[PDB]
Amino acid sequence: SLGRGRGAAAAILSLGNVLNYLDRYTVAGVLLDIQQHFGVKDRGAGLLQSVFICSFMVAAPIFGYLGDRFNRKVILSCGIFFWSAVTFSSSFIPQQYFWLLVLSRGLVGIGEASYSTIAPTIIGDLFTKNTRTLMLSVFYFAIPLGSGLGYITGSSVKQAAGDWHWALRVSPVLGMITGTLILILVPATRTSWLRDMKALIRNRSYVFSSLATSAVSFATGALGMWIPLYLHRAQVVQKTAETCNSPPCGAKDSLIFGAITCFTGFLGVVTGAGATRWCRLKTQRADPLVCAVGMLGSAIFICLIFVAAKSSIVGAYICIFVGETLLFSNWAITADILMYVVIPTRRATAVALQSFTSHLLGDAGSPYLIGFISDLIRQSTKDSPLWEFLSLGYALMLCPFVVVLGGMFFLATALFFVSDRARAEQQVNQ
Numbered sequence: 001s002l003g004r005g006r007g008a009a010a011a012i013l014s015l016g017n018v019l020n021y022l023d024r025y026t027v028a029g030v031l032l033d034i035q036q037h038f039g040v041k042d043r044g045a046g047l048l049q050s051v052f053i054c055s056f057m058v059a060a061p062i063f064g065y066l067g068d069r070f071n072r073k074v075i076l077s078c079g080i081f082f083w084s085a086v087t088f089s090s091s092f093i094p095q096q097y098f099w100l101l102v103l104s105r106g107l108v109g110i111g112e113a114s115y116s117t118i119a120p121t122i123i124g125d126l127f128t129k130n131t132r133t134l135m136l137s138v139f140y141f142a143i144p145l146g147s148g149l150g151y152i153t154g155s156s157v158k159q160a161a162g163d164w165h166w167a168l169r170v171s172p173v174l175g176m177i178t179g180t181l182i183l184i185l186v187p188a189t190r191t192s193w194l195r196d197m198k199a200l201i202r203n204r205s206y207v208f209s210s211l212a213t214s215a216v217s218f219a220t221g222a223l224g225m226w227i228p229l230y231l232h233r234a235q236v237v238q239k240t241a242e243t244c245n246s247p248p249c250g251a252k253d254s255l256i257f258g259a260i261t262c263f264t265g266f267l268g269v270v271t272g273a274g275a276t277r278w279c280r281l282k283t284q285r286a287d288p289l290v291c292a293v294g295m296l297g298s299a300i301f302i303c304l305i306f307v308a309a310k311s312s313i314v315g316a317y318i319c320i321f322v323g324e325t326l327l328f329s330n331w332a333i334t335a336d337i338l339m340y341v342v343i344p345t346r347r348a349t350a351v352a353l354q355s356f357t358s359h360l361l362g363d364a365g366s367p368y369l370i371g372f373i374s375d376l377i378r379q380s381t382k383d384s385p386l387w388e389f390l391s392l393g394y395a396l397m398l399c400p401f402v403v404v405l406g407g408m409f410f411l412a413t414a415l416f417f418v419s420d421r422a423r424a425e426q427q428v429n430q
């Protein structure tokens with residue numbers, strides 16, 4: 001009935017999503033200064049993101065529940081105000097205390113989980129059909145954009161202000177403004193869990209696809225959480241004796257990584273769509289096959305980046321470009337597979353299930369696992385920047401391995417995709 005209001009609501013929701021991801025990844029951008037100032041080792045650095053993801057995983061379903069039974073717009077505004085306040089207050093934590101930052105991360109994760117679980121429901125309720133899917137697409141466009149802007153803002157504010165605290169002191173004002181706008185312009189708005197559990201435990205292609213998504217989450221969490229620090233360590237190790245005065249400044253690598261991520265999000269989605277469209281003419285199980293090929297390519301390039309980074313950095317940058325492109329090529333394809341195999345009646349429930357699983361074996365403790373392994377290698381050898389480099393590299397060498405199992409699981413679901421799709425088709429429509 002009204003177009004301007006719906007358009008403004010979509011715009012403010014998309015801006016809120018951008019802000020959400022920016023606040024999510026600013027800490028990953030600025031972790032080096034935090035680690036240096038607080039005097040902690042890689043264990044706590046991983047623990048930050050691990051606690052964030054754990055809080056998000058725990059708090060998503062209850063927030064969704066409160067969303068469908070109670071009012072959504074007020075809950076959305078309360079959540080954005082909550083994580084904005086916690087983010088602003090986190091910058092004032094003194095050096096002598098560390099667990100304060102971790103609990104602040106947990107509260108921020110709670111707020112972001114509320115926002116992420118709530119907003120798609122209203123953004124899809126407002127519109128319908130082609131308009132709805134276009135609006136959902138422009139909504140989800142915020143992820144590769146949001147992560148990149150988070151890296152960019154963290155690095156830029158660190159470089160300009162000269163102290164890392166201000167990295168958390170530029171976003172909350174935008175958060176409060178976005179809360180006021182979402183309150184002003186936006187118009188106001190399970191069953192048989194046991195049976196769905198029992199039915200879905202027997203869907204083998206569903207299980208294999210969920211495991212593949214878990215492996216992808218593991219890889220992307222570890223990479224997007226640890227790569228800038230590894231690059232900085234490599235740069236300083238090269239600078240040990242290449243010039244003896246070359247700037248090892250960290251404000252030149254995080255920006256490049258952020259811009260690269262913004263590019264590869266869209267690039268990988270586009271190339272995955274093109275590849276699946278091309279390959280659907282040959283066979284019927286082309287989607288898991290192209291997912292598996294993308295996983296194999298990503299594993300290959302993630303293998304050679306950790307070797308190329310020893311000598312040349314531009315080689316590492318192009319390798320990571322190709323790696324994240326081929327890694328993100330399967331985003332929409334996984335959801336398409338899930339849409340195709342699962343019966344409509346439990347469909348939504350199934351989706352939620354996958355999220356839970358993808359947040360348990362994926363990025364729940366993956367950054368902490370990498371930190372733990374790097375620390376274990378550290379204590380067994382000497383302490384030196386060169387050994388910092390090799391220890392972090394050896395710890396991070398675990399990602400292509402799990403990517404290889406992800407590709408194998410996509411092959412496994414490829415074998416049974418046709419049979420499961422046929423069974424789903426026969427069951428529906430009677």
Ligand SMILES: CCCCCCCCCCc1ccc(-c2noc(CCCN)n2)cc1
Pocket residue numbers: 137140143144147220223224261331332335
């Ligand atoms: C280092 C930067 C890492 C940045 C990635 C962080 C991922 C966290 C959230 C997980 C996630 C991702 C993508 C999608 C999705 N994309 O498209 C569609 C359907 C479109 C139909 N035409 N669904 C859903 C959920």
